From a paper:
The head domain of SmhB is largely hydrophobic. This is particularly evident in the β-tongue and helices α4 and α5, which together constitute the predicted hydrophobic transmembrane region (G175—L233). The crystal asymmetric unit contained two closely related monomeric AhlB molecules (RMSD Cα 0.56 Å) with the only significant differences in the tail domain, where α7 from chain A folds as a single helix with a kink at S320, while in chain B α7 is divided into α7a and α7b by a short loop region (T319-V321). AhlB and SmhB use both a short β-strand and a short helix connected by a loop, while SmhA uses only a short loop perpendicular to β1. The second region is between the N-terminus and β-tongue, which includes a family conserved glutamine (Q38 SmhA, Q32 SmhB, Q45 NheA) on the N-terminal helix α1 that forms hydrogen bonds with the β-sheet backbone of the β-tongue. In addition, both SmhA and SmhB contain a family conserved (conserved in all but 1 sequence) lysine residue at the C-terminus (K333 in both SmhA and SmhB) that forms a hydrogen bond with a conserved hydroxyl (T81 SmhA; T78 SmhB) on helix α2. As the overall structures of the soluble and pore forms of SmhB are almost identical to those of AhlB (RMSD Cα 0.64 Å and 0.46 Å, respectively),, not surprising given the high level of sequence identity (62%), we investigated if these structural similarities also conveyed functional similarities.
Tripartite α-PFTs are members of the ClyA α-PFT family. Proteins in this family undergo a large scale conformational change from a compact soluble structure, where the hydrophobic residues are hidden often within a β-tongue motif, to an extended pore structure with the hydrophobic residues exposed in two extended α-helices which insert into the cell membrane. Here we show that S. marcescens has a tripartite haemolytic α-PFT (SmhABC), and propose a mechanism of pore assembly. We present the structures of the soluble A component (SmhA), as well as the soluble and pore conformations of the B component (SmhB).
Numbering used by the authors: 3 to 205, 208 to 360
The structure:
Amino acid sequence: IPTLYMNDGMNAQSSQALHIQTYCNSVRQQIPVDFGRFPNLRESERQINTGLGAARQHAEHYLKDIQPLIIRNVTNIQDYFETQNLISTVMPSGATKEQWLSALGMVSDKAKEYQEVSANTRRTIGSLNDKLIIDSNNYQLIVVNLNNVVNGNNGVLEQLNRDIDGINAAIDGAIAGIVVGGLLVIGGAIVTAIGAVAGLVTASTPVVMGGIAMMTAGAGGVIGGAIVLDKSLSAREKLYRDRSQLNSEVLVASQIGSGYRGLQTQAQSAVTAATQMNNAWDSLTSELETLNANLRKGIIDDSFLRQLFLTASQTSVTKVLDGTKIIKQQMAGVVVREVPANQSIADFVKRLAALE
């Protein structure tokens, strides 16, 4: 069972990591707000842009310091299972009990080192989640204050925040399912695009923060997922259209707030995936330590270990090794499309849906 927990952990963390990576890129592409036209909104502009700087730093911390740890974890799984296959192919024909005890000791020590890497990753994303919880909650105070400065209706603003939170669940879900479905496609790719979360007006700063599309490309390059994803992206754009009675600068502040909270939502999902991955390494190290103790105590013998390691090599190891190779290629091979300045993310995906 540890090998299947390992495989499920790797698939879930790898697919989620691509989603939070794209989300982070959307945060880093958000232009600072400009309330230059309204002099007594200067303090609200500074607070929001201070917030956006902090959000950009959190996104950069994920991209630069955490994503490489998730890829490393996949390499560690590969190296663990290659070492397990080495044991399985060299030791059953002739290895002594002494050699089996050393093998279990040395492979348990390597698994424990990989487990500790997974645990450091979990703690690092846990700390980032915690800072994002604090910062995204404090950010919402700025939006309420700005709504008060312009004598806005706080019931309309709260109804918009509740609606966007609701639709963000659907968008997050649709994207999670698209990336899960594409992760293990041989020769396939993940295609990404960043754009405005609401309809664009030529004559209000556009907000691309959490304005993401993720789709699949097969071996032949043909896009999948745009039709699926188009329903929720258009829904978000429609919920913002239905509150164009709200103050324009409040709307922008609110959209950045939903983006900041959405970045925290992604970080929470990354904690969950990292916890599942650490728990899967724990089950593997626990098994290997138990085998080592059981052999030393004469509760199992070399014949038991021959059976276990020959069966392991022939049953679920090949699927995990194939996965590590496909996952590394997919994570290195993400395709970015540039969205034209006059297309929202929903307009861009709708044009792709029309072609699928």
